[PDB]
Amino acid sequence: TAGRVVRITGPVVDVEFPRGSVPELFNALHAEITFGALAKTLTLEVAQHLGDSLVRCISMQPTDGLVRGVEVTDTGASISVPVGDGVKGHVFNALGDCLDDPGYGKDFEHWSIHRKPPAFSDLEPRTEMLETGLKVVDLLTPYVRGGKIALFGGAGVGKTVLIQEMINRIARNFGGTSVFAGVGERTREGNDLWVELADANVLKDTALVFGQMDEPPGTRMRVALSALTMAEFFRDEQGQDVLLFIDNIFRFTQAGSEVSTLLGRMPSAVGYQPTLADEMGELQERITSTRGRSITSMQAVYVPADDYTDPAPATTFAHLDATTELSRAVFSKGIFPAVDPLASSSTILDPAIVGDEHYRVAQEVIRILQRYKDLQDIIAILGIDELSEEDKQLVNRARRIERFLSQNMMAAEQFTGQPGSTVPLKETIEAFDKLTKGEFDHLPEQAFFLIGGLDDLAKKAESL
Template identity: 30%
Template structure:
């Protein structure tokens, strides 16, 4: 220690003593310096300021979904355990406070809890210093009680809940590391632009609503028109390295059906399914959506191309509405508090291309339009923050037209950046012909149209059948990207434009 500088720290380079003589070009490790580094790290962690989170509180009230506790100071987002004798502890998250009262949202069943139960924050995560490892010298900056969940390659092929616990009865999840649930989105200037097309295996999307790697789209539809089936088609046929599926607030039976009937063993091997069914507490439904996004971020950061399928974004917003209303936030449009609309971009912006073009997350979020109302507040907000929207209509579904994609109402905002000019022009002509037929269909059906009076409508009538056949697709039959474009050119008799 005598050779150290007056600052009281060992030199950062070398960590040891030099060889005797002026010609010696190397240094030899100094065990004393390495031990000193270890002790400095331990002292830094031991002397780090501790918050009052360690002090426990008392449960004083349980109203609806919200627990109220006194005697505990905990930041919003921290995790606590609510326990009392002869009852299993209940994990809860601090979602608000008023004076000395803390409001908590339980992540489990609250049956059996009574006034006076103990409320204790979970222990903070502190990285254990390793001997000679300078990277461990700093105290971990994670907030005390922050929720940390498993991330890693061991999740591939597994079905887990909102906290990473396995649901598939295949034993514990291994080969994973603990990471914070929430992350800050990548700086917008550090993201690579969307320039590469993605083959989804769905003919109508490949040809007319072309998707780029790193794009975020919404599937907008009412209940029962085929959103989940369309997601399944993309999960089966999209060319991606890893598929992450978030089943948020949907029917419980869909979890097993999605895995066995749609993914299959081959698809499951490269997939991670995060499930929080409709009977889960609202806190778990929100955490499951964040966790699924975090899993996708992990694999993106490894340089892989990830397909994130989330069903549904509306259930995520509804869970936030339940929590916000329970803690007293005033409702706004259709009962949704302002925090719901703030949460949506915070979740969606985490998807997209990776840092400096390393990896990507292409995300599809289903959005439930109540009563097929496209002006639903959540649908309207989602449309504004996503890079495109695919609208499924009940009229097409009732006619047996699957996937029930309404081309006229759907759009991909990056299509012009990821396809050739010839492809883009073909798609424009296809849309124009389809729109012309829709405008004149009523006249044709009642017999008021005279053939030959409008050449454009004559062409639309002649091509309407082949165009409808082109847009239909069996859920067990995929269609490649180039195959889809050539089929579109053949359908509207423009083969010379796309040889």
């Protein structure tokens, strides 16, 4: 005995079941579409109970071709993804289907994507700094080994460049095992990544799960859970340390809104779903470094219309330990990676963790840039000349500090042709201390763009 479809509205499908055989929430159901070249087996996920033995489900595939009255069979379990050391090296989708080898993973151990987060008693905060080799990050927003990092920004400001750069900075040398969740990003980038990780030979040590934009919202929101399951398996069972890249996690909340509008739930503010914070929290709290093991996560967050006050970014800000924030304005200045020094933040930027020499320089730089950002309102009208000398001396080196935060990243080599640069922390501290104290105030601003370290600064200045 099994159920029947009785309503269809986009990817959302209502199914009626016998009186006593209603499926539990988040159970997976199978249905058939038999029109033609469009035919396929649909997986539906139970999202609600509507009463009278009727339940409302989210389709993981496009419903096109689904006719009313077709039978629907309950699997009795949630959507299950393959887990195991054999997962590494291959590409998967949200439903556990391998794309590189269709039959792969059918015989592996299967874990449910829906799981409760770790007990509070097993949580412990991390403080060990992670050295990436980017000046602005390592100085003002030091990442945490085993913490949660995020890259915010609008459209067309450097999510992908900086994300693959950080892949080169961490994953290229990380001794552990990596997972890459592509949540609603463009597919061409996924193919580029699948090729690049093989060129660099890193592929054999990382797993990829993709849910790109073309897919309907129902799976577009579950892809994150699908990959997080493999990440937390590598965490809890194998005991390895893990890197969990996710791009872009805003599309998870966007798919949540799309499915919400169909489920019939009333809209919140500007038009997101209610429980937005609850879904995002249920997702993010699972990505945590429990005692004795670690899962380092770098997330990308989209920001529509550059409205940093949009409820979704404003919500996701709460779950992150490090938050690099890109900006349109800094990008227009030609600065790259275009990080906003005053908006970005990191919780471990305190003297007890990073040391006094680092903290003092970071805070002096922040003070200089803040005074600059306050004088901008006059700078824009009357130019620098109107300012008093205590302000003009400050602005002259503020511009230089700002431009020196730029760096010639390895990823940009494919566009600019200039090779990449990695700098150690101590050299960055020395350089910015010298800058704030004025040992380089005599050089022109254009000398500072996209340098790298200090020796490269001298080499470039000599040529001008």
